[PDB]
């Protein structure tokens, strides 16, 4: 049973369409954490109380070192507050816009941590679906941490969604293997494989699987990425096969 007077709000960690994320500390234990604030009124206009209750339900008792812990929740009359873990080193997003590109060691390392987190999620019949750099945070040691679970369920922005999911078809655990491939590409190139200027256009890119490699992208990476980005959901590797991929094993930590 929590309240809003239990916390001292501080620096804004970022703003979102659902609401803003603020740094906060619990008064009694002096515990530092992230406090996401969402307005109940703007939540009704979107009608996603099922996904917020599902995101809370799913991310609650999910315990993994590469997954952002959801400690608890509460609410006043006006809004709805979520009590999350705090990621000291921030997001991978800003990390990416600062370095522009990632080296193969950082990329392969992130992919590994992400596969461990995904392999843990998949063993519980939980699909993240919405895997993107904006939902990737960093721990005190710089480890990866998957945060948002708004679109998470059991078995918009198109850049990371797979062919089957965008065409309205039936999607399974393999939608994350595609996302995992899209993220790997962006880490090495700095932009998504199917990036465009219009929604209508990116849709064609994804559905036809039209992507090309810049020169500086080695063969090891071109192989892993091409395997993950198959139109056929069954043609994609397992999380086991990904982890034990030559390029991953060679450059990961
Ligand atoms: C930031 C930050 N800096 N440092 C040192 C730490 C953080 C930090 N953030 C979180 C978050 C968190 C999840 N989503 N957000 C808001 C958000 C989402 C996506 C991107 C940004 C961001 O960094 N932006 C800066 C650049 N502009 C352009 C675009 C926005 C912000 C914050 C959570 Cl849930 C938990 N712990 C955190 N720690």
From Swiss-Prot:
One of its GO terms (cellular component) is chromosome passenger complex. The active site is at 130 (proton acceptor). It is an enzyme of class 2 (transferase). Activation of CDK1, appears to be an upstream event of AURKA activation. Phosphatase inhibitor-2 (PPP1R2) and TPX2 act also as activators. Inactivated by the G2 checkpoint. Inhibited by GADD45A and p53/TP53, and through dephosphorylation by protein phosphatase type 1 (PP1). MLN8054 is also a potent and selective inhibitor. Activated during the early phase of cilia disassembly in the presence of CIMAP3. Inhibited by the small molecule inhibitor VX-680. It is found in: Cytoplasm, Cytoskeleton, Microtubule organizing center, Centrosome; Cytoplasm, Cytoskeleton, Spindle pole; Cytoplasm, Cytoskeleton, Microtubule organizing center, Centrosome, Centriole; Cell projection, Neuron projection. Keywords: ATP-binding, Cell cycle, Cell division, Cell membrane, Cell projection, Cilium, Cilium biogenesis/degradation, Cytoplasm, Cytoskeleton, Isopeptide bond, Kinase, Membrane, Microtubule, Mitosis, Nucleotide-binding, Phosphoprotein, Proto-oncogene, Serine/threonine-protein kinase, Transferase, Ubl conjugation. Its main location: cytoplasm. GO terms for biological process: anterior/posterior axis specification; apoptotic process; cell division; centrosome localization; cilium disassembly; G2/M transition of mitotic cell cycle; liver regeneration; mitotic cell cycle. The modification Phosphoserine is found at residue 207. Changing residue 36 to R: Loss of kinase activity. Its EC number is 2.7.11.1. Changing residue 39 to A: Decreases the interaction with phosphatase type 1 isoforms. Phosphorylation at Ser-207 decreases the kinase activity. Changing residue 200 to A: Reduces binding to MYCN. ATP binds at residues 17, 36, 85-87, 134-135, 148. Highly expressed in testis and weakly in skeletal muscle, thymus and spleen. Also highly expressed in colon, ovarian, prostate, neuroblastoma, breast and cervical cancer cell lines. One of its GO terms (molecular function) is ATP binding. There is a cross-link at residue 132 (Glycyl lysine isopeptide (Lys-Gly) (interchain with G-Cter in SUMO2)). Residues 7-248 form the Protein kinase domain. It catalyses: L-seryl-[protein] + ATP = O-phospho-L-seryl-[protein] + ADP + H(+); L-threonyl-[protein] + ATP = O-phospho-L-threonyl-[protein] + ADP + H(+). Belongs to the protein kinase superfamily. Ser/Thr protein kinase family. Aurora subfamily. Centrosome amplification can occur when the cycles are uncoupled, and this amplification is associated with cancer and with an increase in the levels of chromosomal instability. Part of a complex composed of NEDD9, AURKA and CTTN; within the complex NEDD9 acts as a scaffold protein and is required for complex formation. Identified in a complex with AUNIP and NIN. Interacts with FBXL7. Interacts with CPEB1, JTB, TACC1, TPX2, PPP2CA, as well as with the protein phosphatase type 1 (PP1) isoforms PPP1CA, PPP1CB and PPP1CC. Also interacts with its substrates ARHGEF2, BORA, KIF2A, PARD3, and p53/TP53. Interaction with BORA promotes phosphorylation of PLK1. Interacts with CIMAP3. Interacts with GADD45A, competing with its oligomerization. This is Aurora kinase A. It comes from Homo sapiens (Human). The gene is AURKA. The chain holds residues 127 to 388 of 403 of the full protein.
């Amino acid at each position: 049973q929590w309240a809003l007077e239990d916390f001292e709000i501080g620096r804004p960690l970022g703003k979102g369409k659902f609401g803003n994320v603020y740094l906060a500390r619990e008064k009694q234990s002096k515990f530092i954490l992230a406090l996401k604030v969402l307005f109940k009124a703007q939540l009704e206009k979107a009608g996603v109380e099922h996904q917020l209750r599902r995101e809370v339900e799913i991310q609650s008792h999910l315990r993994h070192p590469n997954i952002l812990r959801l400690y608890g929740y509460f609410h006043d009359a006006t809004r709805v507050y979520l009590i999350l873990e705090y990621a000291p080193l921030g997001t991978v997003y800003r990390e990416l816009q600062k370095l522009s590109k990632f080296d193969e060691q950082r990329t392969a390392t992130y992919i590994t941590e992400l596969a461990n987190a995904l392999s843990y999620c998949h063993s519980k019949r939980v699909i993240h679906r919405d895997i993107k750099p904006e939902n990737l945070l960093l721990g005190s040691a710089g480890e990866l941490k998957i945060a948002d679970f708004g679109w998470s369920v059991h078995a918009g922005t198109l850049d990371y969604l797979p062919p089957e999911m965008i065409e309205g078809r039936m999607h399974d655990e393999k939608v994350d293997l595609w996302s995992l491939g899209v993220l790997c590409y962006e880490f090495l190139v700095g932009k998504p494989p199917f990036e465009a200027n219009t929604y209508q256009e990116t849709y064609k890119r994804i559905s036809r699987v039209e992507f090309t490699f810049p020169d500086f992208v080695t063969e090891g990476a071109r192989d892993l990425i091409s395997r993950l980005l198959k139109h056929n959901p069954s043609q994609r590797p397992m999380l086991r096969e990904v982890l034990e991929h030559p390029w991953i094993t060679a450059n990961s930590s």
